[PDB]
Design a protein around this ligand. Structure first.
Ligand SMILES: O=C(Nc1ccc2c3c(cccc13)CC2)c1ccc(F)cc1
Ligand SMILES: O=C(Nc1ccc2c3c(cccc13)CC2)c1ccc(F)cc1
Ligand SMILES: O=C(Nc1ccc2c3c(cccc13)CC2)c1ccc(F)cc1
Ligand SMILES: O=C(Nc1ccc2c3c(cccc13)CC2)c1ccc(F)cc1
Lengths: 337, 143, 337, 337, 337, 143, 143, 143
């Protein structure tokens, strides 16, 4: 019973904390529920659909708030399982963590609105949406990629910024009076931003033919530069996720190495209770050796290069040994002859 | 030899409780329970195929004897232990601190009791420098 | 005659099923015909062009339906050739497959409309368009790439979603009353979606200068994030197709390996009818050896690395042998001297 | 004089044909001149600027036509230099080539217009623009890349096409009557195409809120898919140009190999006129050896892998030799002892 | 004092010149200040916000100009520290550099406006913005990438240009009279440019159904081609920055190599003042050896391939030596037997 | 030797039906038809160039004799058979199940009859363990 | 030997001013100041761990003696000097100009005085050709 | 030897027309004109640095003698000729058709007259098979 209770507590902890499988399914369902709440709130903001939208939203936000409260209670109950935090004081000491603070203040805000409120509801829904990460993984990846490609991103930013400013000013000069859109430089800058980003609202567009020519000559290069960072970030994301996969592979290598070394030592030192013990030990040895050698999957050219270069250095040592032996034979030659 | 063959017959009889001359997965599980370790079905099946040469789902006595007839130098595992110790040797110094040995055996894989790591230090750390090279460990283990 | 009939049946089967060359040409022609039917239907939906459009569409859909019917009959006739399905019961058992069900229900729907129908015609044309794959290859590739890059895609989704929501809400606040476009939050969300995707219809755009500034500050990052997944998917598609090519190369390696081993065994064991037999056998041996060694094209750095590391391990074995021999000579030295 | 005349003829041929340096500068200048002619024609098409535009265009097209005529004459004169075509009949036989036909018919059309003409002028200017390639290099690269990535491009085409059709039909259903934009399915398809491509003219946009929701749900995926092929083609272009560079590097390797082998043979066979001859020959030998070894720049991981694997196979042969020698020594051991 | 003064001068020089850490923070702050000045000027250009905008801009531009002047003076004072320029004449000789000229003329222009001026203010602000680089790094990277991918970029330019011209002309023909947007070819070209770039203002769009069909058929390929260069440039930027990182790594390798060789020579030649000297020398030797071997991080497959191929050539030399020794033993065999 | 040379002359006469001393592609096709196998023109041409040293489009008698004078050790095919067996050895265990041998010979390349695979098992599977290593197979085949 | 051990005791006493038998980082800094060189805390710590085998933060006398007992051939630095000289040999000619040696020692790393580079040229440039191969330098240094 | 040294002195005197003991680039150009070949300034400079050990811009007589004292085995060019012939051997058969030799010497690099390619075939194609292996060519050339 108590052991079952602890096993539950810990499985539930892992599900709420870093999950693997169907725990992702539960997280997807809770995300879908909060997303439905958000869209229903959006509809409620409409005037015509206010009645039914609010009617459904009341029950849906009731369900959302009760689910969030029970999940907070369950998370706190779970934190007591990990050795870092146990008993009464441990759970509170865990709750001192800032993410606990954001989650709990979201909960109390939701309860307070439960028991101009539209703006507060929107704010709390956005905060809940942010809360759905729980690990900063997306933000960490984005920041890491941006830092990695800081030079190219800064190049794109600076060049596109200069292009936008220059094109906007030139068009403004070419359309100061003819086109009422560009009566001020700020309007020209707005036009430049909405074009170079290829949004092209259409509220402001050049009409003087010379202005149109300048707009073309600059929009070519401007749109190219403004599109650059999208592809740069895509490549960065791919590279960084590949790097994380490589590191995970190397850790999955590290563990079976320990397993193999331990089992090999046991098998060496274990040399019909005793015969049975040695049999099971050597059996474990072959199993662990197979597991480790399987874990030694290259996964990358550099990886296999390293594994082979280790053997190549071993080869160098062996050929040094053979050089020593042949030198000994050569020295013996005259000595014995 | 014949005496070793008889010892292996005794071991197999202790294993093959059914007595049919094959150690079924259930028999292996029961004996391991006798040892107190906790096996799973998939890991046990992997075990059989690792030690089974016929792939019949059980371990006939001559296969078991051949396994017991397989010595470490015949295992051909020198390269694997080389690679494992290399994995543990981050700096590539050719050695690894005895503290690192204690830590890694005590916090990875099939955790070893203090006695085991102490005797490993005794046999492998012949120089008694705390930094056990992998060359000496593997050569002593194989030879 | 009967052998010719079977050879036909099977060639026709392969053409209808996984095709290689001019069978792709026939498939392209049938796709072009159904596409012409679709565009003619689109024109028929126009009011002015209704007469001629429908006149041509009648005959074109007659041709389409007869072609589809004959192709279905031919496919069923062909399935009897493959050993999985032969005779009478085998063809039906093949037709139990779900894709057969979708195709046949499309056929019967087309016949039923043949003998408000515009909506049904559009639905059946879309279903036919879907049917043109016949292998899920495109869908399989897309799903595989999405799963492979799940982390980066989810990062882009989450970050862009948060950016859209935040920017939309902020602009809505900055343009609640001044601009009639953003009278409700839903309108603001629509604006945010059509801008961050760079579509920029122009029906709704900010006008308050502070609203314009917020729109700029958020649209930069928003458009970048919304463009990310395009490049991510492009890279994923390239990688996955490269992987399929690698696997195909390895299978094309696997087959000649069997050929070489078989022919080498025959040549070894065959050692003037007998002399002629041995001559042809060894001749086959050299031919198969050449074919295989040609098939051993690296195609990749990792591939050549593997092929060379095999030889390097062989080298390690040989140097171990030489170490053994030199040790024997060293031991003999004192023994003989 | 005659030798100088031939050297000129050939240098001029190479400049007109495959150029390297400042010949590119001349080609850029002629391209700029024809481009100026085109833009001046565009301005002439405007009503207000017709007078000055046509005034400048007359002289500019006179210059263009005379330059093109002299270039054609010079090209024909040059073709007589290459051994494939010499004398009188050779130049005509060269002119039989289709590109000569397109160029010459462009020339005669330009002369005919020189001595509703606006449409013919536009056509001839476009044909001239096409003519500026002279090698199909751009078209060859584009076609090669498309063929290489046929699978991913076809995936994008099929999926985006289905998405466009489905989204257009669904919106049309959701906005059949409410929005006058979508009174017919063709209008819906036009909207879908101009949105999924992110062009977003703004003439047609959904207004029914359910229609807006469908438009959002489908435009996300649609714009992603429509953007895919741009990145796919970019990657393909980069890969193909890299491949051409690799092939060029390998040819630049091939030539110095011939040089080295020839010079090495001469140096070997040449073993104070005779001493001077041998001195210059060996001098050439070291020079050619240095040139070749410099030409052996890896340029790629696979290249160095190949060069090293050749030496590794040599190592295998040498270790086989050493195994033979050690076996001989082992066999001698008992024989002599 | 004087030594402290020189150390200051040089640290300040490096901060102003190529900076590493918090010097980037100072540069970011000055960039932010000039950017705030620019945005405040933009607001001043608006009519309503003129009063407060100009009020704040006066003090902000005072701060900007004083900061720029003091930084110019500090830069000149710093140039005297570097050995290239010292004393009185050296600083002026440094100031002869063109970037000094642009900076100083910006300063004098700012002072002159300080003591229709809006246009001059905009020009000087743009010039300041350009000045913020101080090394051409962004421009150098962009130009290098463009040159590297000249072939693909030229392919995209030529193909997209032809597509734009052809599509524009065809639509113009299809909409010469029906749509007032395309009354002239120039309008058609403007439409083509704003669509193929996916800007899609919406001022001009085809309306004749045949014109719409041509617009679709050409806009697909046109938008693909116009989007190509963005991704091409992104890949080029990533590759070039990776190359610079590789070169930096190799220089960081070059320096510790010198350190190791020097320290190894000292340790060799140094063989209780003398014992202490040798102890410290060998101590330095191990430290420098460790630093260098750490500096020998592959960082790339080709790098490790080179480092291992050096050892492989060494292996070839050693196996040649062993072949020589075994040949000697074989020759001795008969001689002694 | 001379007896072998005369045997090769008889073989060539059986081959070169034209009697001109060269086995034209048509003659090779006819003889192979006699053997019942089905050759194609391209594969036959490849055959000739593989066995032809002059590249004249036919096989003159001394080229044929040299081919018959080429022994397996002179073929220098050890590496190729190494690589083939490695390709078939997915796990890299150094062996491959006899069931795998039967399957692969019977479902890939020039399919071998049951007799052939049985005799291959006999000669190569000297240990009779069902897992035939490639080392032993290639060394026996070459030696 | 015993005489060398006594010399090392004298050296350590000159080092371990505290006299506790361990050379603390401060003692190393003071002695190096005596030598006039300028060490930093981090570089000194790196120094200790490089020469310290116990990792106690100081250098006990037997560790110091072992360091003095470590000879160049026992250093196992041949590969490192190989790689350094290869790095300096841009062309890969197998040598490097004596002018290049002077330049690189005088403008990289711990700059060496003219006397040091001259004696290096003397010992390594045995052939006196100005192009000193790395093979000869490293073999003379180790042997 | 002394006779060879005197022969080299005569060769240098024929080279160093200035008589200063150094063959300036102009002297090399004039002598090569005597040979009828057409050198360029850059290629000639490359020539000097290839054969010049002092880098003084000219070839002093000791350097010229040392060049004449450098034998092919001392050149250490075996690997380079290996790689060249490998480049020419597309199929990797280990040989190359004599027709390929004639074609490549006659249409690449410093084109060789028919006599040269014929004598190359004679010496290298010892087997007279038209397919000259690179092993035999390089070993004969070096030995
Ligand atoms: O690059 C990003 N956003 C810009 C894209 C394009 C351009 C810009 C400029 C200035 C500032 C920004 C960007 C000029 C042209 C971007 C930043 C952060 C992020 F999380 C995702 C994307
Ligand atoms: O990434 C895809 N579609 C989004 C692109 C961009 C963004 C999104 C967001 C949420 C949901 C979706 C997407 C926020 C920003 C996409 C999905 C499926 C598919 F087949 C092809 C493409
Ligand atoms: O992929 C190209 N063009 C499409 C882009 C995007 C999509 C398409 C579809 C059908 C047909 C075409 C394209 C559906 C979505 C494209 C073709 C040729 C070319 F030269 C350059 C680019
Ligand atoms: O490729 C660049 N800009 C074009 C993009 C797309 C197209 C073009 C064409 C002609 C001239 C230009 C571009 C036709 C289609 C581009 C240039 C310079 C730069 F710094 C950044 C980007």
């Amino acid at each position: 019973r108590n052991a079952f209770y602890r096993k539950l507590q810990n499985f539930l902890y892992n599900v709420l904390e870093r999950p693997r499988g169907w725990a992702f399914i539960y997280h997807a369902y809770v995300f879908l529920l909060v997303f439905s709440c958000l869209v229903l709130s959006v509809f409620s903001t409409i005037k015509e659909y206010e009645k039914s939208s609010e009617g459904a939203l009341y029950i849906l936000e009731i369900v959302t708030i009760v689910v969030f409260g029970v999940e907070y209670f369950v998370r706190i109950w779970a934190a007591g399982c990990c050795c870092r935090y146990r008993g009464w004081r441990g759970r509170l000491k865990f709750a001192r963590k800032p993410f606990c603070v954001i989650d709990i203040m979201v909960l109390i805000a939701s309860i307070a609105v439960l028991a101009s409120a539209l703006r507060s509801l929107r704010f709390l829904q956005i905060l809940r949406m942010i809360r759905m990460d729980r690990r900063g993984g997306t933000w960490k990846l984005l920041g890491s990629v941006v830092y990695a490609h800081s030079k190219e991103l800064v190049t794109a930013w600076y060049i596109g910024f200069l292009c936008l400013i220059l094109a906007s000013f030139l068009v403004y000069l070419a359309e100061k009076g003819e086109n009422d859109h560009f009566d001020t430089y700020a309007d020209a800058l707005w036009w430049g931003l909405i074009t170079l980003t290829t949004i092209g609202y259409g509220d402001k567009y050049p009409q003087t033919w010379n202005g149109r020519l300048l707009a073309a000559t600059f929009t070519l290069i401007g749109v190219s530069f403004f599109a650059l960072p999208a592809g740069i970030l895509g490549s960065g994301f791919a590279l960084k996720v590949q790097e994380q996969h490589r590191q995970k592979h190397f850790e999955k290598r590290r563990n079976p190495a320990a397993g193999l070394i331990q089992s090999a030592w046991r098998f060496y030192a274990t040399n019909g209770l005793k015969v049975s013990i040695r049999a099971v030990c050597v059996m474990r040895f072959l199993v662990s050796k197979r597991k480790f050698k399987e874990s030694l999957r290259p996964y990358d050219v550099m990886d296999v290069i390293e594994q082979y270069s280790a053997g190549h250095l071993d080869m160098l040592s062996r050929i040094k040994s053979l050089q020593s032996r042949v030198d000994q034979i050569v020295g013996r030659g005259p000595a014995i002859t | 030899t014949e005496e070793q063959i008889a010892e292996f017959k005794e071991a197999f009889s202790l294993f093959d409780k059914d007595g049919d001359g094959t150690i079924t997965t259930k028999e292996l599980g029961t004996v391991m329970r006798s040892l107190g370790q906790n096996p799973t079905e998939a890991e046990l099946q992997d075990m059989i195929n690792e030690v089974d040469a016929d792939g019949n789902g059980t371990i006939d006595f001559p296969e078991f004897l051949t396994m017991m007839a397989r010595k470490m130098k015949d295992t051909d595992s020198e390269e694997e232990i080389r690679e494992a110790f290399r994995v543990f040797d981050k700096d590539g110094n050719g050695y690894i601190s005895a503290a690192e040995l204690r830590h890694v055996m005590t916090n990875l894989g099939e955790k070893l009791t203090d006695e085991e790591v102490d005797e490993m230090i005794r046999e492998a750390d012949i120089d008694g420098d705390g930094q056990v090279n992998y060359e000496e460990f593997v050569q002593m283990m194989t030879a």
